[PDB]
Amino acid sequence: DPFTQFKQTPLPYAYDALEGAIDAKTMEIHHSKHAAGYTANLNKAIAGTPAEKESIENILAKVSQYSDAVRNNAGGHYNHELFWSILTPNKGTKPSAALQKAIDETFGSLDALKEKINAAGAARFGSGWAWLIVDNGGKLQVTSTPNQDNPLMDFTKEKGTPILGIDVWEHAYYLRYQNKRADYLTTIWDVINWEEVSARYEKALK
Amino acid sequence: DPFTQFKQTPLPYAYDALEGAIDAKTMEIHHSKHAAGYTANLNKAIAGTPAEKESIENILAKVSQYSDAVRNNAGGHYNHELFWSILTPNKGTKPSAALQKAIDETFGSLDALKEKINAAGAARFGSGWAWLIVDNGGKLQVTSTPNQDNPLMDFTKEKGTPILGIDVWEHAYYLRYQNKRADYLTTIWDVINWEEVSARYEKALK
Ligand SMILES: [Mn+2]
Ligand SMILES: [Mn+2]
């Protein structure tokens, strides 16, 4: 049906393509059950409200005006859509020259950035997400959020445009890693698509 | 070491005793990794603080006065300790006459109570717990809380003494049920120890 407000973008890889870090079963359930449910519930939650024809960014920017169902499913849809786009089976991507320079000046090195993201992800108690954002000063920042909340939401304290998010809900890693979230965080870097992260950074600065 | 403030209780059954509803691998990780960590981090968090010599119930009753590490691990330890005690491989336990009468007058029947708990469990977005509590007027209530929070905490909306808690963190059900939290909730009734729930009820009314 072309007329639904929100859709899942087709995945640019197979469910078993990311086995360097994420098992195939997780990819399939995570995409076709969890994430698909956020999209369907978002379409339902916005129906008949002022969010009905708004962009996802605009819904998040005014999210406190809407029901909790809009919040949780708008976050869910946005976050997962971003997450799929920043994974890849192709090894060895790296930040653009401009992103690399910004990472080095802000954190020291790519390793130092990964350490900070890993630590933020580990420190998120319960369900949530780790983020790399561009703030309203054009500055890079590492944050985390609970549940499906994100740095675009009106009430979020550390606001900015996400260029990278890593899912630390237990559903994202339990089948392969069980309690070992830190091993998931260490390993996921092998499938992060730094070309996509870099394209998002370019747009955030414009 | 007899002098630590908090210790875990070993399971009063085998890890595979609950395989009607819960896989052995989950029981082992859940008790030896997640719940062991909450106990250890609780003992560390309260050390050298006023919580250091307080009972777990008293810590929780003032938990807003302490750090997040105290709140999260005090809840974690209490909730898991209660959880293990209300599971059993002994099939066909039933509420005591006193508890059954209160259940029937408040909810209508045992099935009605189960429905209500299953619904609270399903509606808890993110990580948390579903609870049956005895409130401060002696009456039964069904609630849910986020993360490791619980009804003994000073800032919980619906306060009371828990007699039954069901863990709806993904780690509690993902290996066996994946996204199907509702199937987990339906099935877990097979292993609820109503004899322990009834003992907790009797004590709560005092
Ligand atoms: Mn997810
Ligand atoms: Mn648990």
Q: Which string of DSSP letters, residue by residue, matches B1-69?
A: -TT-S--PPPPSS-TTTTTTTS-HHHHHHIIIIIIHHHHHHHHHHHTTSGGGGS-HHHHHHTGGGS-HH
Measured between beta carbons, which residues in chain A are less than 8 angstroms from residue B33?
178-179
Residue B144 forms beta bridges with which residues?
Answer: B130
Q: What are phi and psi of A164, to 5 degrees?
A: -155, 130
Of A68, A125, A148, the CB nearest to B147: A125
Kindly list the residues from chain B whose CB atom is less than 8 angstroms away from the CB atom of residue A169. 126, 170
**Nearest chain B CA: its distance from A99 CA (Å):** 33
- CATH fold, domain B89-206, is minor pseudopilin epsh fold (3.55.40)
| Region(s) of chain A under CATH 3.55.40.20 | 89-206
Between the CA of residue B113 and those of A82, B102, B103, what are the distances in Å? 40, 11, 7
Resolution (angstroms) stands at: 1.5
Residue B164 to residues A134, A142, A194, B98, B113, Cα–Cα distance (Å): 45, 39, 47, 16, 12
Determined by X-ray
CATH of A23-88 among 1.10.287.990, 3.40.50.700, 2.60.40.420, 3.40.30.10: 1.10.287.990
Of B128, B206, B114, the residue nearest B169 (C-alpha): B128
Secondary structure (H, E, C), B139-203:
CEEEEEEECCCCCCCCCCCCCCEEEEEEECCHHHCHHHHCCCHHHHHHHHHHHECHHHHHHHHHH
Contacts of A174 (CB under 8 A, 6+ apart): B170, B171, B174, B175
Ligand with minimal distance to B174 CA: 2
For A141-169, give one letter per residue: b (16+ CB within 10 A) or e.
bbbbbbbbbbbbbeebeebbbbbbbbbbb
Q: Which residue intervals of chain A bear CATH 1.10.287.990?
A: 23-88
Chain B residues whose beta carbon lies within 8 Å of the beta carbon of residue A146: 126
